[PDB]
Design a protein around this ligand. Structure first.
Ligand SMILES: Nc1nc2c(ncn2[C@@H]2O[C@H](COP(=O)(O)OP(=O)(O)O)[C@@H](O)[C@H]2O)c(=O)[nH]1
Ligand SMILES: [Ca+2]
Ligand SMILES: [Ca+2]
Ligand SMILES: [Mg+2]
Ligand code: NA
Ligand code: NA
Length: 159
């Protein structure tokens, strides 16, 4: 059975854990320990293929960075600093992968919140500059969550 090794990165508080737990448990967590870093497993069918997702939810390991097959680079659309921080996460990934061609999806999380300070078009443009997709999500409503993870799988498959 095929396994896809995924790594979720981004600034503290953007919703890395909430996204991961929403995908695994179908539940929105309101106060998950910001320091807990662990890997989670889920069997899913994607485009007719039964596969295993092996997901590291990082909390700011070396093994997953080195052997991770794709990365969700997450910021929150109500957190300008987190968006600005994305560049540094992608630079770290390029250094470990020794490549500028790494399966990756840019995720703008917390799209349910009204205090938007990063416009969709800003993030689209960032993603275009990296040659990667941009997807908006809400870990709270579940909007876009499966799409983000499954798109990452589809990006790994093109690699
Ligand atoms: N409204 C809203 N809050 C969110 C969302 N995702 C995460 N949060 C909240 O943001 C805070 C940080 O989430 P968390 O998963 O711990 O972030 P992490 O540090 O990236 O793992 C928590 O209070 C979450 O409940 C979302 O999509 N919408
Ligand atoms: Ca290197
Ligand atoms: Ca390397
Ligand atoms: Mg966390
Ligand atoms: Na602005
Ligand atoms: Na690309």
């Amino acid at each position: 059975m095929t396994e896809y090794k995924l790594v979720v990165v981004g600034a503290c508080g953007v919703g890395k854990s909430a996204l991961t737990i929403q995908l695994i448990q179908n539940h929105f967590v309101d106060e998950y320990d910001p320091t807990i870093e662990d890997s989670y497993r889920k069997q899913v069918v994607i485009d007719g293929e039964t596969c295993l997702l092996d997901i590291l939810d990082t909390a700011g390991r070396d093994q997953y960075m080195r052997t991770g097959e794709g990365f969700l680079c997450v910021f929150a659309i109500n957190n300008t600093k987190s968006f600005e921080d994305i560049h540094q996460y992608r630079e770290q990934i390029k250094r470990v992968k020794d490549s500028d061609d790494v399966p990756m999806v840019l995720v703008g999380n917390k799209c349910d919140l009204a205090a938007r300070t990063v416009e969709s078009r800003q993030a689209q443009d960032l993603a275009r500059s990296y040659g990667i997709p941009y997807i908006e999500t809400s870990a709270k409503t579940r909007q876009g969550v499966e799409d983000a993870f499954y798109t990452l799988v589809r990006e790994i498959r093109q690699h």
